[PDB]
Structure formats: structure tokens, C-alpha cells
Amino acid sequence: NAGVTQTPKFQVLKTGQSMTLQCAQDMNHNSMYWYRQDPGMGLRLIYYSASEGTTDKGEVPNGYNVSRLNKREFSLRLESAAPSQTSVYFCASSVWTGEGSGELFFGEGSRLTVLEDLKNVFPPEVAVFEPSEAEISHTQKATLVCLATGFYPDHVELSWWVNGKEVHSGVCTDPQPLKEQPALNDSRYALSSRLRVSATFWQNPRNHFRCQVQFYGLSENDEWTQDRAKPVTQIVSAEAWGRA
Amino acid sequence: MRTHSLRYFRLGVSDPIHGVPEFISVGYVDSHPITTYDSVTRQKEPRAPWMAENLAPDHWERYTQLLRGWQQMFKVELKRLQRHYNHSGSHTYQRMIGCELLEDGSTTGFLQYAYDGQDFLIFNKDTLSWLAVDNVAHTIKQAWEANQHELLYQKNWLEEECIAWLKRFLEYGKDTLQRTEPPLVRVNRKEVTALFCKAHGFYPPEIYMTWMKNGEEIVQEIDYGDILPSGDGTYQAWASIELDPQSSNLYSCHVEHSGVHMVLQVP
Amino acid sequence: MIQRTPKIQVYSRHPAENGKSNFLNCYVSGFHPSDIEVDLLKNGERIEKVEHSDLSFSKDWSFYLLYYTEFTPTEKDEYACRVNHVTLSQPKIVKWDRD
Amino acid sequence: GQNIDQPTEMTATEGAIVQINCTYQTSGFNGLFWYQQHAGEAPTFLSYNVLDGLEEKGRFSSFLSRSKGYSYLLLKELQMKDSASYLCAVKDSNYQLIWGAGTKLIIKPDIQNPDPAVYQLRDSKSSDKSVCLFTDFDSQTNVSQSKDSDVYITDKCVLDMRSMDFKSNSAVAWSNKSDFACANAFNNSIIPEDTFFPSPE
Ligand SMILES: O=c1oc2c(O)c(O)cc3c(=O)oc4c(O)c(O)cc1c4c23
Ligand code: NA
Ligand code: NA
Ligand code: NA
């Protein structure tokens, strides 16, 4: 029971480039769909597959094409990527289509940014800041903060690691990133996150905290001509230890 | 307005002969075919011109994809029936769904399935339940009746969506569906001696003919021909009664058709 | 499955007066399953140009068909309909009783 | 012209009732669905109505009037985990789904012992930025975006320390500007008057 498995979860493309989006479902469904989610609009169907052996267009097929390879898989293909195709893509499936009450089962989404140039891609700078002593005295709690700044596109996953294991209790990361220069259509982003722990936990000196940002960017095949380092997919981290 | 009905028919065949399709589906507005699809063309197409002329290629394209899905659903469902019957060889499976707009404005709706040409499951959209004729059907019922939502969907469709389509199609095809062509009714004798009441040339095909004797409805003594297509958009029929050699009687043919009643006395 | 055998009815589109073009109809109905073969005969020979309707569905789950050919009846000529089904051990022939 | 219209965003309070509307003008009607979409994640099925009336599924109920073209999703006894978008969808006469734009549901936490304050966090030897934390205030406070171009201020965010069943609001301000201080970081925001500003050392 995997449900609907689609890949990749993130992708940076240059204008005119090619890309295929994978989608599989292990549920023995017959109908599969490819949707496109954009801000301020309802979902929009690109292509659909009523059963194995047939596909047909949807509301927005131009610039895309598809292949129902077998009963399990349904692939969506861009062939000359274009900026307006920057979007989050969701593959979905139902037992049948043309039934009335059947719900849709969705994949995790695939997020594509299409760019004229790659000279705007940037990995995030990550820094960790340690609790205010004033805070510990006043509230008996310690809040560490992590800042990830100057990244582009917005393809990041921020996790906290405490003593080498991921933690979620006590975390709050921004739901939306901050455009570091709102006026610009290509401004870079900042993202903040917060770990609050008890003063006692912070005051043990063997306790180790690390904030980690996974950035999805360029790959071996993409061309790079800039002076700075190639913004490849990479993990950037920052840490702090407890202070007695 | 006379009574009108819309019906969709599906047929599946488990081991079809060379050529013969394993799936067929046809729509009717009253007695007129309006839509067809089958597993060899794999395309839904109008069988009525006032269909083709009033629905854009997008409709046929959309329903073509749905019928390719329904064909497969039927293949699967019939595989299941035949294996729980433990049946070898070729067997058939059928569906019918649709609705009636009666003359007084009230409506009806119906959905049922058949296996080997006998009743298998009949829907009752007022109790929201299925009737099963045997224990293979009983197992489909327990399964279908557990998706309370899917039955609610069928009740909505039979009651609102079906009726809405039928109203739409009645308008597209009104020059055909709402015309009246009264019948040409004669009488004649045939060898015992028999009175044959023949009518022909009429549309729609709903017609009632009966023989009366001295003002009483000779019945069980009447012999009813069927209503038959003439080949040109109209229908014929007849009824015969058998004459008594021993006493004279006043025999008269009665025909009702589209709100008009006709009486031919036999001198 | 219960296999139902076809009811066969041979008749003309209009009342046939000798010498006047008409249409000869063989209507085959109530059969199940749907495999069927129909031929119109002239004096026992099969007619080549014979048109037919699509297979049709009845509420009781059986099927009907209409086979027809334009023709002009004469005193001498005799016309039949020849039907074959899986419920039929051999062909069944039904003459067109003009009377 | 088929359209579905749902409100863009709604704010209710933790533990309260909220009712999300969805009105539709469609070509036929074969059912109206509700889906839930957590931020960053996939939509999941919540409910389905095709006849008229109300159906109850736990803390969620969903209503439908076919005559009026109208459905609502009613969320009882609100919880922070209910913060998401809610998407309504209608099957039309041709069984093809038409999707509303979605309603963002924001849940204000019930802050039991407010203690609003702004703290200076320790500089990092690996960064040139100074970092201020506005924290522990009531849900009634709103945090404004920076007015100075080299000051950056995040919106508010709710943290849950489940070990102590404790919840706090917080927002972050930072800058590498010389003139930058915590005492002046949130000066474009209407903060509580009792806000703690520890002496700066
Ligand atoms: O809207 C419908 O259009 C149809 C067609 O156009 C058709 O050719 C065949 C069918 C058919 O077999 O079954 C149907 C249903 O059970 C149903 O609930 C709705 C429809 C059809 C249908
Ligand atoms: Na359901
Ligand atoms: Na009759
Ligand atoms: Na019929």
C-alpha cells in the first residue's frame, strides 16, 4: 500500500528544456489524472486516462503530452519547457471514471520552476542563533532560531536535528517563504524556523542542535558559466551545543 | 405532451464469435436510437441526425472515453458473474437505465441488470436498495449496498439528470418525436370467418385496438397482432376476432391513438 | 442459459397491389442470445440487395431486427424469410402470406 | 459558463465552529466533494453529498442544497491541525470535475497565559545578522512587514511543545544594519503595551 507515487518532488528547468514526470499507483485503479495547481485558481486537468488503453486531453493540454504506459503508470511530458509551466503538478487516480461517488487519490505533488537563465539559482545561507538568556530567566524555556536566506527557486526542506535525530515537537517553520525584495519578480527568499525547548534541556552541555536545509537545484547535466559555484542540489546545515 | 422515455442499454458477451463484439451500448429516446458505441469501433456516434446536429464533437469525444472505461468495467463484472456461477462457454450480461416523463408531469426511473437474458439485479430508488434473484446476485447486492453514497448518486441521476437530458433531447428532436401521424384503419374478412382490423401509417407506435361485440369488449376472444415498424418512420398493426355462424352480432373495431378514438362498425 | 427463439413476421411496408413497387419487411424479434442470420428469398433464392437495421434492445432483455428490400410484387413471384439461430436445429422459413 | 466560488481565506479561533461555503453554477450535477489540503502536501478526500441534507463524519459535517447550488463544510471544536486549505469540487452533467479555488483556514490559538516580549538572540560567529524574537503574545496581535528595506520580519507562527501542552506565538526580525536593535525591530506593528524588553547589556 504505497498509494500514488510520483517523482521528482522538485525540479529546476531552463526555457526550452525537456522533462518527464513519473507517476505510479499500486491500488489497481483504472483512471489516472495529471493536474496543475496555481495560486488563486482551482485545479486544472491537463490529460486524463479513463482506463488502460486510452488517454484524452483536459482543460489545459497545450505544451504537454502523456503516455499511459500500463495499468500502473501515467507519465506527463513537457517537451519545450516554458516559464508559464512553472507550477505544482499532482498525479491522481480513481477506481473508475464515470462513476459518481468515487473519490480521487492524490500523489505528493511535483514542483517545477521554469527559468529563462539559470544565473538566478542560489542555495540558501543557513545560520543558527542561540537562546536569549533573558528568555530563560523570564520563562524557563529556550528558543533557538534558524534563518535560511538568499535562496532561489523556493525549493527547500528545513528540518531540526536534536542529538542526531529529527524532531518536530517544538518546531515552527514559516508556512510561506519571505521574498527578500518584494518588488522583484525574481527576488530571493528567506525562511525562518524556531525550536523551543525547556531551559533544563538547553542547559545540558552534551545536547547538540542542528538546523538543516535541503535545497533542490542544478544537476550534473545543466550548463554553468557563472563565476560563483554551481548551485547544485545540496544540504546546508548549522549547529549549536548546549551552554551550562 | 405524450409520455417520453430515455434509455441506455449495455450488452457484454463473454466468448464472442469472430467479428461479434464483446461490448455494445445504445441509447434510445422513445423508440429512436440516438447513440451507439461498441468494442470494435471504440467510438460513440449518433444514430439520429438531430443528435449529430445538436451536440458538438467535444461531446462525442468525451463520451467515447467514458464508454471505453465502461466497456472494461463490464468485461470485469461479467468475468466475476461467470466465475461465481461456475459457468463454461459464452454468456451475456446486460444493463438498462433511464426514465420516463409521463404526460401529467410526473416521472419514473429505473436501473437493472440481466445475466443470460433474465433479471439479475433491480434497483429500487425509493428504498435505496437492490433486489437479487439468486445468490450470485445477493453477493453483488451486499457489495453495492455498502456504498450508500453510490446509491444516493443513482437516485439523483435517475430523478434529475436523466429527466434533464430527456427534456433536452425532446427539444433537439421535436419535429420527429412530437409529430402525430394518424392511422389508416380498414376492415376485411379472412377464411370459419374472421374480422381483421388493420391499421397502418401511424406515429407514434402507441395504439390500442380492440374488437367489441354488441357494446361489450369481446376479450380472450380477440387475437392481437403486434405493433410493427413499416420501414419509413411509421407502424402498422391489426386485431382479429372470430365470427359466429349461428347468431348475428354487431361487431365494431375500436382504435385509440394520440388522444383520438375511432370506431368502425361492421354492417 | 434460458434461450429464446425468434418470432418471425413477413409483411409489406404498404398494402401490396400487384404491379406496384413496395417494401418487403422481415421483422425478427424476441430472440436471445443476439447471434442471428436472416435472408429474404425470391422463389427460394437469396436476394442480394437486402438492407437491415442495427441490432435492437427490448426491456425484457431480448433483441429485434428489421430486414427489408424494395421490390414489386407480382402474381407469380413467391417471397420468403429465412432465419437461423442457435435455438433453431436447422433454418426456419416463413412465406409472405399476402392474404 | 460553469463556475465554483468559495471564499479565499477564513480565520476562526481554536475550539470554535467554522462554516465554509461553496456555491456552484454548473451544467448538470452529479455530486459535490470536499477535499483537505495541508500546506506543502496532497489533497485528501473529506466528504461527498449528492442528495439534499446534512451528513456527519466525526468533527466535520457537510451540507447540500441542490435547489440553491450551495454546500458548506462545518468544522466543530476547532484544532490547530485543522489549518489547511479546503477545496470544493462538483461533478457536472458529463462527470468531469470543476474545482473551486480553495479556502485557507487559519486557526488562532487560545493563549492562556500571555507573556509578550522581544528578545535579542546571541549573534552567530558565522553570520553578520542580528536577530530579534517577538514571542509569547495573544492571538489578537498582528505582526507587520518591515518598513526599512534591510530589515526583514517574518509573519507569526504557532509552536506547540507537546511535552508541556504549551503553545506560543512568535515572529522573527533580523538585519545586518548597524542601527538595528530589538527595541525598535517591531515598531511598525501594534504590539501589547505590557511587552517585556529586557535591558540590553
Ligand atoms: O449520461 C450518460 O450517457 C450515456 C451515454 O451517452 C451512452 O452512450 C451510454 C450510457 C450508459 O450505458 O450508461 C449511462 C449511465 O449509467 C449513466 O448513469 C449516465 C449515462 C450513461 C450512458
Ligand atoms: Na465515497
Ligand atoms: Na395491438
Ligand atoms: Na426500447
Q: DSSP assignment of B89-147, as one string?
A: S--EEEEEEEEEE-TTS-EEEEEEEEETTEEEEEEETTTTEEEESSHHHHHHHHHHTT-
Task: Give the three cell numbers for residue D70.
Answer: 450551495
Interface check A59 vs B, CB under 8 A: no
Which residues does a gap of C–N over 2.5 Å follow in chain D? none
Same-domain status, B137 and B190: no
Contact (CB, 8 A) for D108 and D14: yes
Give, in order, the Cα–Cα distances in Å from D119 to each of D134, D141, D181: 7, 17, 10
Q: Could you count the other beta carbons within 10 Å of the beta carbon of residue B219?
A: 11
Residues of B in contact with A47 (CB under 8 A): none
Q: What is the DSSP letter of B165?
A: H
Task: Give the three cell numbers for residue D84.
Answer: 489547511
Parallel, antiparallel or unpaired: strands B92-101 and B107-115: antiparallel
Q: Which ligand is nearest to the CA of B228?
A: 3
Domain boundaries, given as residue ranges, for chain A: 1-116, 117-244
Same-domain status, B237 and B127: no
Residue A116 Cα, gap to closest chain D Cα (Å): 25
Give distance in angstroms: CA of B202 to centre of ligand 4.
18
Closest listed residue to residue D117, CA positions, set D134, D130, D131: D134
* Residue B59 counted as an annotated binding residue: yes
Query: CA of B43: which chain A residue's CA is closest?
Result: A54
Give distance in angstroms: CA of B33 to centre of ligand 4.
8
Q: How far apart are CA D174 and CA D191, in angstroms?
A: 17
Element (H, E) at D201: none
Same-domain status, B107 and B196: no
Chain A from 75 to 114: CB within 8 A of any D CB: 90, 97-101, 103-109
- Of the partner residues B63, B66, B161, the one whose CB lies closest to the CB of residue D30: B161
Query: CA of B191: which chain C residue's CA is closest?
Result: C99
Residue with cell 503508470: A73
Same-domain status, B200 and B77: no
Residue with cell 436471445: C32
Residue C45 Cα, gap to closest chain B Cα (Å): 23
Task: Give the three cell numbers for residue B127.
Answer: 428504498
The one-letter code for the residue type at A7 is T
Q: How far apart are CA A211 and CA A128, in angstroms?
A: 7
Counted residue by residue, chain C has a size of 99
> B55 in helix, strand or coil?
coil
Contact at CB, D66 and B155, closer than 8 angstroms: no
Contact at CB, D51 and B156, closer than 8 angstroms: yes
Which of these three, B118, B144, B179, is where a domain ends? B179
Best mutation site among D51, D55, D64, D97 for testing chain B: the one with the most B CBs within 10 Å?
Answer: D51
Tell whether the torsion through CA atoms of A200, A205, A206 and A210 is positive or negative.
positive
Backbone torsions φ then ψ of A222, nearest 5 degrees: -70, 145
Closest listed residue to residue D68, CA positions, set D16, D17, D32: D32
By most ligand atoms within 8 Å of CB, the mutation choice from B6, B7, B8 for ligand 1 is B8
Task: Give the three cell numbers for residue C32.
Answer: 436471445
Residue with cell 438498462: B96
Tell whether the torsion through CA atoms of D93, D97, D101 and D106 is positive or negative.
positive
The one-letter code for the residue type at A41 is M
Same-domain status, B233 and B127: no
Residue B219 Cα, gap to closest chain C Cα (Å): 23
Which of these three, B146, B179, B212, is where a domain ends? B179
Tell whether the torsion through CA atoms of B171, B176, B177 and B178 is positive or negative.
positive
Counted residue by residue, chain D has a size of 201
Closest listed residue to residue A75, CA positions, set A32, A106, A108: A32
Residue with cell 503595551: D193
Residue with cell 449495455: B10
Closest listed residue to residue C92, CA positions, set C39, C50, C51: C39
Residue with cell 441490432: C55
Contact (CB, 8 A) for D27 and D48: no
Contact (CB, 8 A) for D20 and D105: yes
Domain boundaries, given as residue ranges, for chain C: 1-99
> Which CATH fold would you assign to the domain A1-116?
Immunoglobulin-like (2.60.40)
* Residue B10 counted as an annotated binding residue: yes
B120 lines ligand 1 (CB under 6 A): no
Q: How far apart are CA B67 and CA B73, in angstroms?
A: 9
> B21 in helix, strand or coil?
coil
B–A contact (≥3 CB pairs within 8 Å)?
yes
Q: How far apart are CA A205 and CA C15, in angstroms?
A: 111
Domain boundaries, given as residue ranges, for chain D: 1-109, 110-201
Compute the half-sphere exposure of residue B243: CA atoms within 13 Å on the CB side of its CA: 16
Q: Which domain holds residue B227?
A: 180-266
Contact at CB, A132 and D91, closer than 8 angstroms: no
Q: How far apart are CA A25 and CA A7, in angstroms?
A: 12
B113 lines ligand 1 (CB under 6 A): no
Q: What is the DSSP letter of D136?
A: S
Same-domain status, B62 and B79: yes
Closest listed residue to residue A84, CA positions, set A138, A38, A119: A38
Which of these three, B179, B200, B223, is where a domain ends? B179
Give every CB contact of residue D184 below 8 A, 6+ residues apart in sequence.
Answer: none
Compute the half-sphere exposure of residue A135: CA atoms within 13 Å on the CB side of its CA: 26
Q: How far apart are CA A21 and CA A55, in angstroms?
A: 16
Instruction: Give me the resolution in angstroms, 1 decimal.
Output: 2.7
Q: How far apart are CA B219 and CA B196, in angstroms?
A: 15
- C1-99: CATH class: mainly beta
Same-domain status, B130 and B216: no
* Residue B200 counted as an annotated binding residue: no
Give distance in angstroms: CA of B167 to centre of ligand 2.
30
Residue with cell 402498422: B236
Same-domain status, B187 and B222: yes
Interface check C14 vs B, CB under 8 A: yes
> B73 in helix, strand or coil?
helix
Give, in order, the Cα–Cα distances in Å from D1 to each of A139, C61, C68, D28, D87: 58, 40, 47, 12, 20
Backbone torsions φ then ψ of D108, nearest 5 degrees: -75, 120
Contact (CB, 8 A) for C79 and C10: yes
Q: How far is CA A138 from the centre of its chain?
A: 38
Element (H, E) at B68: helix B57-85
Number of independent structural domains in chain B: 2
Q: What CATH number is attached to the domain comprising B148?
A: 3.30.500.10
Crossing angle of the two packed helices B57-85 and B135-144, in degrees rounded to 10: 130
Q: How far apart are CA D152 and CA D186, in angstroms?
A: 10
Cis status of the peptide bond prior to B229, with omega within 30 of 0: no
